[PDB]
Amino acid sequence: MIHFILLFSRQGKLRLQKWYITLPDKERKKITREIVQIILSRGHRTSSFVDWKELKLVYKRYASLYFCCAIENQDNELLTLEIVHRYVELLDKYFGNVCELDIIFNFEKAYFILDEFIIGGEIQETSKKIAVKAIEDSDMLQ
Amino acid sequence: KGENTSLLHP
Amino acid sequence: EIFELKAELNSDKKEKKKEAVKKVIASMTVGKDVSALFPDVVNCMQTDNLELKKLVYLYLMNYAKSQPDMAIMAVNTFVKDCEDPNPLIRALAVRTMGCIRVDKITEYLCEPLRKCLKDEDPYVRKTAAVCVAKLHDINAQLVEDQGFLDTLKDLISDSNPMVVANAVAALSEIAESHPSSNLLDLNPQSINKLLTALNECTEWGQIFILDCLANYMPKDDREAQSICERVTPRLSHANSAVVLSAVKVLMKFMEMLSKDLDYYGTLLKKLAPPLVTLLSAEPELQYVALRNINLIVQKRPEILKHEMKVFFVKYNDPIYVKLEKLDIMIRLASQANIAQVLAELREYATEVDVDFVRKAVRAIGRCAIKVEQSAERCVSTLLDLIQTKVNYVVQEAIVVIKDIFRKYPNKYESVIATLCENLDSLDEPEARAAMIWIVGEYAERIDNADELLESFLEGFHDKSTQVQLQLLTAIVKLFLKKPTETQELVQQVLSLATQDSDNPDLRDRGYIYWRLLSTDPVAAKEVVLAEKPLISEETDLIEPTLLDELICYIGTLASVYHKPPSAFVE
Amino acid sequence: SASAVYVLDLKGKVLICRNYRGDVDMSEVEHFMPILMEKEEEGMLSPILAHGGVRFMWIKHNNLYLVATSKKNACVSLVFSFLYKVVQVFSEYFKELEEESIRDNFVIIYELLDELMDFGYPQTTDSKILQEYITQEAPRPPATVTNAVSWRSEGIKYRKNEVFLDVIEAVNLLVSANGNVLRSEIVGSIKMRVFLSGMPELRLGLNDKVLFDNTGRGKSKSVELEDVKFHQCVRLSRFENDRTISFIPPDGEFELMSYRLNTHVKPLIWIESVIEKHSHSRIEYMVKAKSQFKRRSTANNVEIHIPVPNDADSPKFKTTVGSVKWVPENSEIVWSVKSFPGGKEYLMRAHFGLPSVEAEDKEGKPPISVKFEIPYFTTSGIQVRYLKIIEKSGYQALPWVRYITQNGDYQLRTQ
Amino acid sequence: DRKGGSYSQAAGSDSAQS
Amino acid sequence: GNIFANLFKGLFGKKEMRILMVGLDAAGKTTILYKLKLGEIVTTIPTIGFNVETVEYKNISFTVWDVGGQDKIRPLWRHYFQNTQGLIFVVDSNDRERVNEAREELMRMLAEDELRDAVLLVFANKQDLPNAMNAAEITDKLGLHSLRHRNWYIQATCATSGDGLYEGLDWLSNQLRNQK
Amino acid sequence: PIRLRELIRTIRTARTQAEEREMIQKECAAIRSSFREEDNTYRCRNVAKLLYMHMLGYPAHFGQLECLKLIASQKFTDKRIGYLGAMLLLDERQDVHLLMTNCIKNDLNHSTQFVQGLALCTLGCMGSSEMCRDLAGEVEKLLKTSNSYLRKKAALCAVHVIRKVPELMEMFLPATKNLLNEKNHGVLHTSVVLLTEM
Ligand SMILES: Nc1nc2c(ncn2[C@@H]2O[C@H](COP(=O)(O)OP(=O)(O)OP(=O)(O)O)[C@@H](O)[C@H]2O)c(=O)[nH]1
Ligand SMILES: [Mg+2]
């Protein structure tokens, strides 16, 4: 399961954060700062994979804002990248031409979409249209 | 800026 | 962009040339490599407008090392400008000549430097003095060949106090890099002449004038008395650096002063108000003032004996200033202000700086160790802090108690019961080891010492090497003192540290303890539980040889870092 | 002995830099920001950084860090003095200290930086003198810089000769939580705004204890200033000989003398604060202010700052005199009073709730500070005697001065 | 008027000290 | 300022009021709340958390927040003290062993400096078995007369039927509301 | 009732970190004042602002009881905000989720498919050692249902409970029997994940 998923910008500002592991707030902040420093101090040919604290810290940002994942050492690495790409595509479809400005404005919607997509670090919606339809139906409820 | 750009450009 | 800028610069219109120069300056400041256009701006260099000449000179200076080959097309312009009637143009040309880091360029600039050495303009004299110093720093051999030392020496004996101060500073810098051979020292006449111009030098000229006296060594008391009398007015200057230089000069002169004469007492009385004034300076200079006070504290500690109220750290004081305030208070701690120091430390323990709290605990412990008259007060403060229910404060209090016990344990038997139950669940190696050592050495006033050591023996094989050694020592001491209730405990400790302990030093210590136990238990009391002598505390005072050298180095980088002048430069 | 003084920005961008010795590469400025971030994040941040064998000394300005790199064991105090002079010059020339002016006046900024210091040795520091040779909207350098009088420009002509003095008092009181005052120091400030014709040489005379004792008049009320620091125009020799305060006043507002001595008198304001803070239920602010100053004096714009709880909310104010406003930005209650006559006694009763959930970490106990400012009040009792205004041409001067008493380091330790 | 204490006229020297 | 709108609103009833529901577990608190809100005895599992509801009666919306009596939930009553103006206590007279624990919990909750404006509202639950005590024996055992500055009222209600609930509501309205 | 968008714009307009902290405190003062009054109309905007501030790095200890109060509310937006607050600022070491067990149990039998799914996701994200003990019975009840949109959520809740409580896996052996014929990809994936975890 994915221990934590956090959307951080290139300048260091974090646009998303979802940790599936219960940690102290100071410890969580320190871990996030260390992850940002490692990502901010990494090149473009580092393979986007880091084994930090025995955790598969996978970083792959498709724009200025980067994305990170932390899975245990028990599964394949390309699966995390595929899941990240699928989540990005689903978010773009739900929003429509997603940019950094809209991500901050749609933080609650982004959190709801992440909850409806992955729960507890495990994959919850394998299809891409069923999750979008469910999100639209939930939004239309009011 | 660099923030209004699409995440995937699709 | 670049092509358009080059075309604009290759035009005959001054209005577009000024705009192009401004754009080039903005691009370089914006972080654009405009050195590729340096040869293009070379043609548009000899201009009547003064605004564009400064920009061209700045671009050449900033684009001189990058394109040294293209800089060969600027000697003629500098030579032509070195005789301009306008003093500002001459000063700018002199400054730009020394700023060009070209090995083949300073060779052709010697003639203009020689011509401007006797320049009548005092600003021109200062500019030439700066250019000579820059050339000597770039090429000491070239400066020696040009014979500029005689001109620089003769500059101090001429009019223009600002130019004289600049020449003195240049001579000091040249001698600073020189190997001490052929030093520019002057007799008492030169010192008197400089003192006469000290009251006429500017704010920057005062520092340059006082720096020369830092190297001279007085040989007579009358000369020293006159120097002290002349430097006394320097303490009433609004310039903090001038005040610092004057204080350093006075301290250096005090090394030869006679304590029998009344000049030393007057100097000591006149120095405290200066220190008080400097202590209320800007935050940037507060650290410098604190470092200077600490450096001069070890030399004449009787000057600031009554200066204790000002040593308190302010609420808005910076972290660096707060840290220095505690060190200043510790260095100036005395039994007269013991209650005030304890009150300040008690107030300093309620702050939110964990590093600040640790520093306050260390300072309180140092004050308690230094003065035995407040040992009871320090113990009470430590007990109150432990009762404060602060984890870092608890560890600090445990460390302070452990340190105090080894120093003054004769009347420390009344705190074992209070410290017996003080939340021993803390896993800090500096606190757990200290508590174990205190229990082992003070295993007489606690009737449940064996029971307390039982909880610490669960993970003795994996606690720590120092912690394991301290626990083994405490167990051995308890067995030697009371072996009826710890007969099995000693055997268990020996089995755990001798069989399941893989530490080489720990294994050797356990083997030695087991051999002593199996050889003669009676002799173990006189061998292991012996009365140790007085503990020699680490003296925080610097070495006398280093203190004297640091006295001369006043206001430099070595005073803040507390390192030798040759131990910090590269 | 700084190698190059540069002006940085809050994002690490260098607004402007100017090398003076060239012994350090300009690329070292890039490593300054990460070093500062590490030092701040570890508590080791200091104004003087150190990148290997090169020390990066910087001070925090209004919006940028005035970083001055150096390589050798240069005079750190000299560097600080040069930085302070540069800051004063920038404030005089530019009314604002922000990025809007750093990128707006670079044409004159480069010239000012080149003229101020050369090869690490500062040369020009007179803002008025520098304004006569470097302007943003050039003639030969003025002879005043070359002449001995670099703080009084000759040839200045004015229709009238009016000088406005300022007797600024700074009441600093350090009252511990036990109720005793530890640090009670009063710093005098003799600042005059001189606007006359020519180069007058002020001959200052006041009611100093040392001067009265020397003249034999050490029986009346005389100020015994522990620290007396004259300005640049003040002649040190004259004061050292017989306390003769003779100096050429500058053109404009300047600080001539600044007294600094301890105070053994009662505080002008006696503030008694009470804290009936319930355990996560409510809090009480039993703040009582007693004016120990003379009844003939009024403290204008009195703002007694009382630190409220960090998570406190829904406050209720039950006071007697003075408006009370809770500012969430400062996280404290300011006992604001427009005019506070001497001897007044204002009682306040604060009452607010608290969240049920306890805080994870402590917040500390900041001291209570007041912002009282009572002008026309001389607590120290130092009385100015005369000001010898002498001009070579000869004119009748009409000097003016006002005595202002304000609150300085008047902090009260919380319980 | 002006806050901070009204400006007052000052003398030239200590007339009582000669 | 003008208060005409307040008078116009109060002409037809504006005051709402609040209420609290505290007591030990299995004391009929959930059933009592259901009867007050709905009017029927609804079987419910033990209250792990709490139940929040509102009831409109006598032109006053008396909001009721049920609080459990679990050992891990006993110290959580301090959270409900915030923004609380009323409180109703439900006793369990059928638990002789738990009577002392309930009395101790009531004394501990009554010793809070923040909860002072709320008067005592004792509800005599389980008033259907012969072992149930009267309206004075329970008060004497709990020492309700020794609560200084506390307006306590003892009322006995039967969970199965619902007798006396209207009397308790009227007494609470009279104690809180001080108008005609 | 300051909207979350206005707060985001105000934060983006702040330059200095001290200025950002001052603005955050100014907004938090109004948020705490509204919360202390027992406001129920604009509670969603306050919850969103508090979540944004907590993500920004400011303390949010006082904003815990409001999330609990909104969790047991009836509005869908309020329920979603409360679930988000419990998922973000609620943790096992927080100790404030103990009272949320009753709210979760009440919402476990809710007719709305969005409230039940949100509650299941929140329980899975914040699975505790004691909440799962009192919530294990409800998880198994929903595991035998025929809701395709809820089968994955039930499987995820069971997996989270098993990970948090390894001794509770004995009650899941007969619930997952004969579940390899699910046409939906999500239900089959959830069943496979549950089998692998077991
Ligand atoms: N037969 C009967 N039982 C009652 C009566 N009143 C209370 N009880 C018992 O009290 C218990 C209370 O259940 P609820 O009212 O639903 O919930 P509660 O009072 O809040 O108790 P907890 O949920 O455990 O905190 C019931 O299970 C009944 O067994 C009554 O009038 N008749
Ligand atoms: Mg119930």
DSSP conformational letter for G167: G
User: Which chain D residues have any C-beta within 8 angstroms of a chain G C-beta?
Assistant: 10, 311, 313-314, 328-329, 331, 353, 355-360
CA–CA gap between residue D301 and residue G80 (Å, rounded): 49
Residue D367 · residue C348 · CB < 8 Å:
no
* Residue identifier of the C-alpha nearest atom 16 of ligand 1: F30
CA–CA gap between residue C91 and residue C127 (Å, rounded): 6
Both tokens of C93, joined, read 């040309």
CA–CA gap between residue A57 and residue D267 (Å, rounded): 61
- Phi/psi-derived region of residue C243, left when phi > 0, alpha when psi is between -120 and 50, beta in every other case: alpha
Contacts of C170 (CB under 8 A, 6+ apart): C129, C130, C132, C133, C152, D121
CA–CA gap between residue C299 and residue G142 (Å, rounded): 83
- How many CA within 13 A on the CB side of residue G135? 35
Residue reference for tokens 């307006």? F151
CA–CA gap between residue G119 and residue G128 (Å, rounded): 14
Atom of ligand 1 nearest to the CA of F125: 6
Contacts of F96 (CB under 8 A, 6+ apart): none
DSSP conformational letter for A46: S
Contacts of C153 (CB under 8 A, 6+ apart): C171, C184
Q: How far is D175 from chain C (nearest CA, A)?
A: 12
CA–CA gap between residue C123 and residue C121 (Å, rounded): 5
Q: Is F70 a catalytic residue?
A: yes
Cα–Cα separations (whole angstroms), residue A26 to A36, C20, D360, G59, G72: 15, 54, 10, 11, 29
CA–CA gap between residue D33 and residue D64 (Å, rounded): 12
F28 lines ligand 1 (CB under 6 A): yes
Query: Which residues are registered as beta bridge partners of D19?
Result: D4
CA–CA gap between residue C349 and residue C482 (Å, rounded): 39
What method was applied to determine this entry? cryo-EM
Both tokens of F45, joined, read 């599992």
DSSP conformational letter for A40: H
The DSSP bridge pattern shows strands D162-175 and D411-412 to be parallel
Beta strands in D44-115 (DSSP E): 48-51, 54-60, 65-70
Report H helices in C388-486.
Answer: 391-407, 416-420, 429-441, 449-456, 465-481
Amino acid at D366: P
Burial class (CB in 10 A: 0-12, 13-18, 19+), C508: exposed
- Stated as kind and residue range, the H or E segment containing F167 is helix F165-176
CA–CA gap between residue C42 and residue C46 (Å, rounded): 9
CA–CA gap between residue F108 and residue C343 (Å, rounded): 39
Query: Which residues are registered as beta bridge partners of A67?
Result: A7
Return the number of other C-beta atoms located less than 10 Å from residue C262's C-beta: 9
Cα–Cα separations (whole angstroms), residue G177 to A124, G120, G147: 21, 22, 16
Return the number of other C-beta atoms located less than 10 Å from residue C81's C-beta: 21
DSSP conformational letter for C237: B
Determine whether the interchain pair B6/A65 forms a contact, defined as Cβ–Cβ distance below 8 Å: no
Residue C258 · residue C264 · CB < 8 Å:
yes
F138 lines ligand 1 (CB under 6 A): no
Residue to test with chain G: of F30, F48, F81, most G Cβ within 10 A = F48
**What is the distance of C-alpha D349 from the center of its chain?**
34
CA–CA gap between residue D171 and residue C214 (Å, rounded): 38
Contacts of D103 (CB under 8 A, 6+ apart): C29, D15
CA–CA gap between residue C349 and residue C397 (Å, rounded): 11
For G27, the closest chain D residue by CA position comes to D328
Using only C-alpha atoms, chain G has a radius of gyration, in whole angstroms, of 19
Nearest 5°: phi and psi at C350?
-95, 5
CA–CA gap between residue G116 and residue G103 (Å, rounded): 11
CA–CA gap between residue F134 and residue G162 (Å, rounded): 50
Q: Which residues of F are annotated as a binding site?
A: 23-31, 125-128, 159
Question: Closest Cα to residue A9, out of A45, A59, A50, A78?
Answer: A59
Residue C74 · residue C67 · CB < 8 Å:
no
Question: Closest Cα to residue C272, out of D262, F107, D5, G63?
Answer: D262
- Stated as kind and residue range, the H or E segment containing C158 is none
Amino acid at C380: S
Amino acid at G68: L
Cα–Cα separations (whole angstroms), residue G1 to D155, F89, G30, G32, G134: 65, 36, 10, 13, 38
Return contacts of C244-247, CB within 8 angstroms, 24+ apart: C244/C278, C244/C288, C244/C289, C244/C292, C244/C554, C244/C555, C244/D77, C245/C206, C245/C207, C245/C210, C245/C211, C245/C214, C245/C554, C245/C555, C245/D77, C246/C210, C246/C274, C247/C271, C247/C274, C247/C275, C247/C292, C247/C296, C247/C554
- How many CA within 13 A on the CB side of residue C556? 20
In SS3 terms, C449-462 reads as: HHHHHHHHCCCHHH
DSSP conformational letter for D223: B
CA–CA gap between residue A124 and residue G153 (Å, rounded): 7
- How many CA within 13 A on the CB side of residue D325? 8
Question: Closest Cα to residue D77, out of C279, C245, C241?
Answer: C241
CA–CA gap between residue C275 and residue C393 (Å, rounded): 33
- Stated as kind and residue range, the H or E segment containing C318 is none
Query: Which residues are registered as beta bridge partners of D16?
Result: D7
Both tokens of D145, joined, read 């810089």
For residue G176, the SS3 value is coil
| DSSP assignment string, C162-224 | HHHHHHHHHHHHHHHHS-STT-----HHHHHHHHHHHTTS-HHHHHHHHHHHTT-----HHHH
Chains D and B touch (3+ CB pairs under 8 A): no
The DSSP bridge pattern shows strands F121-125 and F88-92 to be parallel
Residue D145 · residue D355 · CB < 8 Å:
no
CA–CA gap between residue C34 and residue D219 (Å, rounded): 73
CA–CA gap between residue A105 and residue F88 (Å, rounded): 44
Return the number of other C-beta atoms located less than 10 Å from residue C257's C-beta: 18
Both tokens of G183, joined, read 């046409």
Q: Which domains does chain F have, with CATH numbers?
A: 1-180 (3.40.50.300)
In SS3 terms, D4-38 reads as: EEEECCCCCCCCEEEECCCCCCHHHHHHHHHHHHH
Residue C236 · residue C195 · CB < 8 Å:
no
| DSSP assignment string, D365-393 | -PPEEE--EEES--SS---EEEEEEE-SS
Return the number of other C-beta atoms located less than 10 Å from residue C116's C-beta: 23
Nearest 5°: phi and psi at C546?
-70, -35
Please, what is the Cα angle at D350 between D349 and D353, to 5 degrees?
Answer: 145
Chain E, residues 1-18, CB within 8 A of chain D, namely 2-15, 17
Determine whether the interchain pair B2/A100 forms a contact, defined as Cβ–Cβ distance below 8 Å: yes
CA–CA gap between residue D220 and residue D37 (Å, rounded): 57
Nearest 5°: phi and psi at D243?
60, 30
Residue C467 · residue C440 · CB < 8 Å:
no
CA–CA gap between residue D263 and residue D17 (Å, rounded): 45
Both tokens of C85, joined, read 């009637």
- How many CA within 13 A on the CB side of residue C535? 11
For residue D373, the SS3 value is strand
Sheet holding D201-206, edge to edge: D245-247, D201-206, D384-390
Asked if C455 reaches chain D (Cβ–Cβ under 8 Å), the answer is no
Chain A, residues 86-105, CB within 8 A of chain B, namely 88-89, 91-92, 97-101
Give the distance between the most distant pair of CA atoms in chain B: 19
For residue D324, the SS3 value is strand
CA–CA gap between residue D58 and residue D69 (Å, rounded): 8
Both tokens of C497, joined, read 């540290």
Return the number of other C-beta atoms located less than 10 Å from residue F6's C-beta: 10
Both tokens of B5, joined, read 């750009």
Both tokens of D275, joined, read 């804290």
Chains C and F touch (3+ CB pairs under 8 A): no
Please, what is the Cα angle at F127 between F123 and F133, to 5 degrees?
Answer: 85
CA–CA gap between residue C506 and residue C468 (Å, rounded): 7
Amino acid at A122: E
Nearest 5°: phi and psi at D79?
-65, -40
DSSP conformational letter for D137: -
F98 lines ligand 1 (CB under 6 A): no
| DSSP assignment string, D162-215 | EEEEEEEEEEEEEE-TTS-EEEEEEEEEEEEEEE-SS--EEEEEE-BHHHHHHH
Amino acid at C388: T
Q: How far is F131 from chain D (nearest CA, A)?
A: 39
Question: Closest Cα to residue D369, out of G78, G98, C316, C415?
Answer: C316
Query: Which residues are registered as beta bridge partners of F55?
Result: F62
- Stated as kind and residue range, the H or E segment containing C361 is helix C354-370
CA–CA gap between residue A56 and residue G28 (Å, rounded): 37
Asked if D356 reaches chain F (Cβ–Cβ under 8 Å), the answer is yes
Residue C238 · residue D231 · CB < 8 Å:
yes
Q: How many whole angstroms from F31 Cα to the centroid of ligand 2? A: 7
Query: Which residues are registered as beta bridge partners of E11?
Result: none
CA–CA gap between residue D253 and residue D255 (Å, rounded): 7
Subunits in contact with chain E (3 or more CB pairs closer than 8 Å)? D
Residue reference for tokens 């009831």? F55
Residue D182 · residue D229 · CB < 8 Å:
no
Question: Closest Cα to residue D360, out of C367, C251, G64?
Answer: G64
Return the number of other C-beta atoms located less than 10 Å from residue F42's C-beta: 11
DSSP conformational letter for C537: P
For residue F137, the SS3 value is helix
Contacts of G78 (CB under 8 A, 6+ apart): G43, G44, G70
CA–CA gap between residue F46 and residue F35 (Å, rounded): 17
Question: Closest Cα to residue C48, out of C23, C85, C20?
Answer: C85
Instruction: With beta carbons under 8 A apart, name residues in chain D contacting G32.
Output: 311, 313-314, 355
- Stated as kind and residue range, the H or E segment containing A5 is strand A2-8
CA–CA gap between residue A119 and residue G152 (Å, rounded): 10
Report H helices in chain G.
Answer: 4-13, 17-36, 43-56, 65-71, 76-89, 100-108, 113-125, 131-143, 148-164, 185-197
Contacts of C169 (CB under 8 A, 6+ apart): C129, C133, C208, C211, D121
DSSP conformational letter for G126: T
CA–CA gap between residue C366 and residue C207 (Å, rounded): 38
> Resolution limit in angstroms?
9.2
Burial class (CB in 10 A: 0-12, 13-18, 19+), G186: buried
Burial class (CB in 10 A: 0-12, 13-18, 19+), C402: buried
- Phi/psi-derived region of residue C493, left when phi > 0, alpha when psi is between -120 and 50, beta in every other case: alpha
Residue reference for tokens 């409970």? G161
F159 lines ligand 1 (CB under 6 A): yes
Both tokens of C540, joined, read 């925080």
**How many residues can be counted in chain D?**
415
Cα–Cα separations (whole angstroms), residue C54 to C32, C90, G156, G185: 19, 12, 73, 75
DSSP conformational letter for G81: H
CA–CA gap between residue D18 and residue A105 (Å, rounded): 43
Residue F89 · residue F23 · CB < 8 Å:
yes
Burial class (CB in 10 A: 0-12, 13-18, 19+), D47: buried
Return the number of other C-beta atoms located less than 10 Å from residue C404's C-beta: 20
